[PDB]
Design a protein around this ligand. Structure first.
Ligand SMILES: CCCC[C@H](NC(=O)[C@H](C)c1c(C)[nH]c2ccc(O)cc12)c1ncc(-c2cc3ccccc3nc2OC)[nH]1
Ligand SMILES: [Ca+2]
Ligand SMILES: [Ca+2]
Ligand SMILES: [Zn+2]
Length: 367
């Protein structure tokens, strides 16, 4: 049936700024919120403002030293932390910016709060578009991510769920999450990503977990230009097999929008409908589900994607004609919700897709 949806958002999230020319733009979270408000999707959800996650909540995963550094570093005192910046990988892809720690607190607060709501059986779905920062490591920032809100949310789900399934459709390998749970069978991580001469350089289909975690990490490496057809020939069959074999009791779905056609950093060719089909597929299993954001660097498309995925979560049909909103000019020249794929070549032949799917199916038989 239709499901209850709780949505997490802080009105200040859009004001955090990574710096001039940096592709990560928290403003896209505010564009998403304003678009979904203007479509009237607020009348259908319970809207919550997440608390600022404490350093203590963050150290359930991250090292005390790394969290202490994040809570301390500021653009005005950076000069005194030259040593720690190198140690914790802060200052290149992951710059020091005003309110960095508060931004991490809000991103994490939404994911953890959503997991608590699911644990209490008070919602069917919890949504936190400011979360999904899957690259952060135990004691290091990485790929525009500082605090791994996903790992923290999964640890919260593990208090009441024996097995948790994590699915990541961001164009980049979900390395921080996979690494956190690499040697456990209590979390199965499934990542679909571009692999080959691309960040973070991990996620080979031969990375399948280790020790008790062997066969509990699944990686589907893809080439440039994947389209809705190709993604659609493999996503439902793999997720169906994972659901059958693993039988998770909760699911976390990272909906990174950098896998869409026309992304500033991505090289895939999915439309918003193609990307949202993943949400439709996962939602049909009727399991407690935490939906998170992630990458997405052509911000008009990120807002379209996450607004449509929120409509999918609510089983609410919304028109293609965009309603007027505070960022209406960003959606020109068409002012439509849905996007068209480009003419880029799909390097993922149908035979390649079937062959990788078959290799993963062999690994899934080992559960
Ligand atoms: C989602 C995160 C993607 C990160 C990614 N980083 C990298 O590609 C770097 C070189 C990298 C590193 C450190 N490790 C790697 C391992 C494998 C690999 O193939 C690459 C890397 C990135 N792609 C765009 C940028 C980028 C960063 C900027 C920072 C400040 C200002 C402007 C920037 N512009 C950028 O692209 C307009 N960075
Ligand atoms: Ca991924
Ligand atoms: Ca695992
Ligand atoms: Zn990404």
């Amino acid at each position: 049936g239709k499901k209850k949806v709780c949505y997490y958002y802080d009105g200040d999230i859009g004001n955090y700024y990574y710096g001039q020319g940096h592709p990560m733009k928290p403003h896209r979270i505010r564009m998403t919120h304003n678009l979904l408000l203007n479509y009237g999707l607020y009348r259908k959800m319970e809207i919550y403002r997440p608390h600022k996650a404490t350093a203590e909540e963050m150290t359930k995963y991250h090292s005390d030293e790394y969290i202490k550094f994040l809570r301390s570093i500021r653009p005005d005192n950076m000069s005194e932390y030259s040593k720690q910046m190198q140690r914790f990988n802060v200052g290149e892809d992951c710059p020091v910016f005003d309110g960095l720690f508060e931004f991490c607190q809000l991103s994490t607060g939404g994911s953890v709060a959503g997991a608590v709501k699911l644990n209490r059986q008070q919602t069917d779905m919890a949504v936190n578009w400011a979360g999904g920062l899957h690259h952060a490591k135990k004691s290091e920032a990485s790929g525009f991510c500082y605090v791994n809100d996903i790992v923290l949310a999964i640890l919260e789900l593990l208090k009441y769920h024996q097995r948790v399934l994590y699915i990541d459709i961001d164009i980049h390998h979900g390395d921080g999450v996979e690494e956190a749970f690499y040697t456990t069978d209590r979390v199965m991580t499934v990542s679909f990503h571009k692999y080959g001469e691309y960040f973070p350089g991990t996620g080979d289909l031969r990375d399948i977990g280790a020790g008790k975690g062997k066969y509990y990490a699944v990686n589907f490496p893809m080439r440039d230009g994947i389209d809705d057809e190709s993604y659609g020939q493999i996503f439902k069959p793999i997720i169906s097999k994972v659901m059958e074999m693993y039988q998770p009791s909760a699911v976390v779905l990272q909906c990174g929008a950098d896998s869409l056609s026309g992304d500033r950093l991505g090289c895939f060719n999915l439309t918003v409908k193609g990307h949202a089909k993943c949400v439709e597929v996962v939602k049909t299993f009727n399991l407690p589900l935490l939906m998170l954001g992630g990458g997405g660097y052509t911000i008009r498309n990120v807002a379209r994607c996450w607004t449509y995925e929120t409509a999918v979560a609510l089983d609410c049909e919304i028109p293609n004609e965009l309603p007027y909103n505070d960022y209406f000019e960003y959606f020109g020249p068409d002012f439509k919700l849905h996007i068209s794929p480009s003419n880029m070549t799909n390097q993922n032949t149908p035979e390649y897709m079937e062959k990788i799917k078959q290799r993963l199916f062999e690994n899934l038989r080992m559960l």
